[PDB]
Each structure stands twice: as C-alpha cells, then as structure tokens.
RNA sequence: AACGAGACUCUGGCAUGCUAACUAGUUACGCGACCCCCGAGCGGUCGGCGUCCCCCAACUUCUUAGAGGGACAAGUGGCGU
RNA sequence: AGCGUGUGCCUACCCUACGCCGGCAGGCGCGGGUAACCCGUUGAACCCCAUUCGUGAUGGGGAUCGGGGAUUGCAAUUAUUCCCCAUGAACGAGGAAUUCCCAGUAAGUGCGGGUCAUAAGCUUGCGUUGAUUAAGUCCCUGCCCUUUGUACACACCGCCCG
C-alpha cells in the first residue's frame, strides 16, 4: 500500500520547468501535466488556462470531461 | 504562494492548510458541509482560496462567528442545540463541548432509569430495530455436548 | 534490486520465487534474486500424477523453488516448472539464496551513506568491489560471501580496491556476530 | 529448426467434434499448390471459402 | 460528392488491410462509410449478419459494458471520438489505420481446447480472430483507467497505439503471446 | 373410430382504401390581436413566431374504433426411396 | 413517456388546478371532476450542456446515535410516517460453492395498481436507454422411444452375507 504527494501551489523549480517544457509535448492535457510535474489536477487545469492567454499553446478541443491542447503550430 | 504556514490550530484541533477553505474547517466537531458554507458567507470570505491563504485577522473573524451565530443573524432553525432542557437556550455546540453534552444526556436518561437509559446501558439497539439477525459481534457457538 | 551479475535468468537452472496469483492456465510469480520480475508456472508443470486440490501444491505469498524452462530476452518473458525439481536442488537453491540475502543485507545497509537519494547508489555499490569479488568464480560456484570471509581473516582483500568504512565494518560484523562462537569440536 | 506460416482455403465443412460440440471439422486446400488438401479442427464459427492461418502444415488430426 | 463521407473528420479511402484472411470481416470503405458509429440495425438476427457492421460501431458496442455502463451508448460515442483526436496528435497518422493495424496484431491464430488440466491445439477462424481482438483491447483500456487521473479516452488511445506496433506493453499483445505459447505445448 | 397435439380465443406489426366525430385534430382563410425587422423590400399587401382568439370554412393525414383486406412454404434455384 | 386510478351504495374516507402565509414538512381560502370533458399538452428518471474536487476510506459510502418541528389517529414510549442541524462504521470487487438468461431480449432507469385512518427495501403491470456471445452438443444433471439382464414389485433411498 502506497501514497502520492502532489503539490497544491507551484515553486520556482517547477514553475520555470512549466515554461521551459512547452515545446517538448505533442499532446498537452491536465492529467499528463499532473503525473509528470507531480501537481494536482485542479492546479494543472489552472496552469494550462494561463499559457493559453499568454498565447503559448493551441486549444484543440473542449468538453466537460476532456480538454485537449497542442504545441504552437510548428514541428 | 509566499511559502506561508500550511497546518494551523483553531479550536484545540488541527486544520490542514491545504484543502479549500469550506472543506478544511469541517475538521472541527459540530461543523458540517452545510454550516461551514453559511459561516464563510456571513464572514465575507471568498470560497475559492486554500485554507493556508487566510490572514491572521480572517481566521479570528471566522472563529468569533462560529461561537456566536445568533448575533450575525444565522437562523434558529439551523442550530444543533434547540431549547436545551436545563436552561432553555439556543446555540451551536462544538469540539470537546459536544462530547460533554452527549455525556450529560445519557446520564440524565440513566438516573431516572427510563427505557432509553437501560438500552444504552445494556449495549443494545436504542431505536426501533429488530435484533435476531443484524448487529452480530460475538463468536460462532457449536452444538456439541 | 538485482542480487547477481546478469539482467535475466539462464535456461534449465533453479531460482527462488514468490507466488502472486493463480488463473486458468497457470500461476503468476515474482523471481526474488532478480528485481521482482514477472514469470509464470503452467498448471501442467505442477505434478507427475493427479492433483486432489491446487491450494495444497501452491498458495499466495509462500516462497518456492522452480526451474526456468524457456526465456525470451527482448519481450521479457520467462516460463517456470516444478515437476523437474529434485530435493537436493531445493537445498542448493536455499544455500544460494541464504548466501545472497546475507550479502545483500550488508550492501543495502552500507548504502545508507552520502546522499542515498536513488537506487543508483545501490547499483554503484554492487558494481566494483562486490561484483569483482565473485564474477571471477561463477564456474567454481562461490559467491562474494567467501571473499567477505577472506576479508575478515585479512583485510588486504578490501585494501586492493576503492573502499568505505561501513563497507569494511558491516561486512565484518555480519560474519563475526555469527562466527565468534568458534566452539570446541 | 524454424518453419514458415502457411495459408489455406476452406473447401468443405464435415461436422462438429469435442465433448460439448465445440470444434468444427473442416477440409482445407493450400494456396501455394492447388493439388494439396488436408483435414483440420477449428475453434470459432467457420464458413465455406474462409482462409485459415496455419502455424504448422505437417500435422493432421482426426476426431481429436 | 456524396460518394465520399468523412466520418465527421477522417477519410476512409487511404486505409489498407494487410492480412488477406481478415479483408472480408473488417468492414471499412465504400457502402460501410457512415457519418457516426451509431445505428439501430438488426445485426443479431442471423449467424453471419454481424460481419456487415462497421468496425468503429463494433468497438463502440463493446465499450458500453461493465455493469454500471449498460445501455449508455451516447457517452460511448464521445469516448471513441476523443480517442481518435489524441491518436492523430501522437502519431500524425490516420486514426482508422491505427485501429485496423491494432486489430490485425491482437487476434490469436492458434489456441488449445479443453478435454479433461488436459488440452489439445486447434486453429482459430477469421470471425473469432476479430471478435477476440476487440474484447482484449477494450479490456486493456478498462483495467488501466480504474485508479489513475488518466481518462478512458487517453487509455484507449495508449492501448491502440501500442497494439498497432506490437510493443508488448499493451494488455492485448501479452494475452495473445500467452495463448499461443500454451497451445504450442499441447500439439 | 375416440381424447391429447394442431385448429380455436385474446394480443403485436401493415391500409393517404371504407364508415365519421364542438368529450378528437389538421389545414386554410373572412379574418382579428401582440412581438421582431432578421426578409426581395418599410414600420406593408407579402416575411418570421403561437396550446393568442372567433368560423354560421373545408376535411380526416396525425387520435379513437367498427367492417372488410393480407401470408399460403404461394414464386425462382438446389437437395430428397 | 406509456399502462392506470378518482367523491365507498352497511361501511362515511376520493383525485386536485389557482391565490395567499412559512427554509422545510405543512396551513388557510376558493373552484373543477361520477370523468376522450377536471387534476392533464400527465413539463418522469437515467441521458444531454457548463462548473467545482484530484487517487486521499477523499467532496466515495451513509450504518449508528443527540436535540428540535409538523401531519394521521380514540391512543405513537419498545422510537407510525415526514422535515431540519449534528455524528460519520464496515466496505478497495469478495474462499470452497452456486442462480437466471438468446433480441427491443439481459442489464440500467423511473412511474401506476394491490394492501392503505397513517405507509415499500415486496409483488403485479407500463414505458424509456439498449449490448457482448450462439445458431451447437450429449460431456455433467434430467426427459422420450426401442432392444437387453435381474434374486427388485414397500419397486436401487430395493434386496441381501459372515
């Protein structure tokens, strides 16, 4: 029997990584951000809306149960 | 973030400063989901923030509202002690005060030896339930002699 | 972590294992001398004669001795058998396992030095000294337990290489706390 | 040591076999030589003119 | 003009079936191109009628399964829709090619029948190969999602991508390579 | 030769063909009324929306329910003393 | 959505629109219906669209138990039923065994009728969303027909030896 320990707010070692990792991923989604950065799904939802208003990522699709985002139109 | 304090002590009980404020204060006995929302609504606190994001004067505003509901216009029909049998008051009872209020109620029934007080003393079901087939907590007994 | 030189077991030799579940075609099992890797025993490989119940040949969480009948290196597939194993080979399996569990109980404790943040330190401490102390002797059949017994009677074994003081003392103690009753015979 | 895959076409269905009627018994013709035909047992639903994939061609079976 | 139907967003004409035993049983292209994987058709009424159902609807039927999900077909159409959108971002390829190749790799071609712990090896028919493939990859997607922040739309995409290359990380490839190992010992 | 089986009785799916309805509706207009200009084009004859309202208009597609109709292994290809 | 019920003939009770008072259960006033006419275009649940939570026995689960308020009744304590604040158990897909099912079916989902002064976790009907697997066999448990053997007819759960 085991436990995760996901963060509720950022710190600079993980917030600078959020801004550096943007071009690396073909698929951007709250769950893949959560497991890869060790972040709660509600912080992953909030972080991906900021990058969209900064113009750094493209929204592919939205629905109640599933958002989808991708890299900024090249590569 | 501010790296602020993320565990805090409120009424001789510990609150995790890591849940949403309306679900952190329900760690106090006598404060359910329904009552915690109404207290924060009278206290003028935004429900969107984490419990470690409240300032020192914001927690004192919530604590002073929980202990005196009737002066901040929380209704009488909301409260968990109504016309208390010995002195006729209306209030909400919290923390270690709720333990003692039940402790006094069970002894008050036992002293006059009413049927409720005897069922609580013998350890049986107090409300109307049957006892032939449910609530079993002993051991299997064999038929052999 | 691994207890041995190599990533995967070799064919037609005996390993110590622990049973995790039972299904329609076989039992699923974790190998113990390797890093808990998956393998399976087929229900046809349990006995030479009729089975009255399966639960008294195998049950979950018990340790067991089996041969490896087939391996595929690329996909990581291992097939196991019990019909094959003679009781001398089961005693030999318990000796290999005891000689390995004692050495691992030294190295796992000696690793609690420097930063110790990752299993990288366990694999780095297993390599060099403990690995070169028995890679040379796989065919004769010794393990690093015998090199540690030589290092107890003369530490020149340890002085021949890059070294740590827990790696000296914990190694010596896990022999000497049991060997000091060198009694009358 | 190793042998290749072979493909064969169903030319007739002969009946059903096994303890509960589970397997169809069938005649198949190899697609590399139209003269070569054999009998096989098949687990699923089968129809005339289906193609089977054989992991060994040299084995042949009668009534299990 | 009406001879080409894009299934909302995805073309059928560029798709290929590379195993000649399955071309009759994987329904794609021509009269089997539709706008949505949902019809009220009477496919149960005769023995081989099942083979005329479009393969994306057969995946949609087999997904509305596990007790709490019986009859909920409108929820199950959007799972397939959002899985195909994730497959196109990861691979850059047509989602219908990924589904067809996952079905061609996942169906077992030898198996052993039961006769008394005792078994005998037998051949598997092309209709049972396509039936087995769908059930295995739906089961693989269903077991991985059960306690993870991953949605079932992400798990169904991961399972189809791993099956289309035969990686042995998928549930369907491990189970196929177990059935053919056991049957090879019962010759 | 007799009973059981089957036939028989109720029920489901089809009829723009029949009979005929203010305790069931539709369409249309003498028209009448509210709202919008989005419409060729105006605030209109003409357009859009209505369980908003009369007909001493026409009718039975949708609802009700009486009479009849229809399916027989009847047609075409194989297999069967 | 579809199937139904409605002023009780001794026997004394029915189904409800609309307005006003109350957080709620509920209360007062005033109309229609002995019913294709009134409740009623029977604004049903799952489902559908948007939000919040984040793998934690958790905002999953709701047993157990304290205090207060209405309604039926001649009478409610061994709590009739209903409403409100509080308390917050076991339980992480279940051992040997074992039941039902082949198409608008299984399973999911809610609504009428019966019993009823008060009241379904039962049962008997109705609609709505809607699959996977088979088109076979006599292996297991049984049924039908024929040939055959018998020391059985209380009929194999029979009869009988030291």
mmCIF file of C-alpha atoms in Angstrom, chain C residues 106 111 114 139 156 163 166:
data_model
loop_
_atom_site.group_PDB
_atom_site.id
_atom_site.type_symbol
_atom_site.label_atom_id
_atom_site.label_comp_id
_atom_site.label_asym_id
_atom_site.label_seq_id
_atom_site.Cartn_x
_atom_site.Cartn_y
_atom_site.Cartn_z
ATOM 1 C CA UNK C 106 25.298 -5.841 4.149
ATOM 2 C CA UNK C 111 24.331 2.230 1.026
ATOM 3 C CA UNK C 114 26.457 10.042 1.230
ATOM 4 C CA UNK C 139 32.057 -21.513 -12.626
ATOM 5 C CA UNK C 156 44.104 -6.992 2.190
ATOM 6 C CA UNK C 163 36.616 1.391 -0.114
ATOM 7 C CA UNK C 166 30.723 0.890 6.686
#
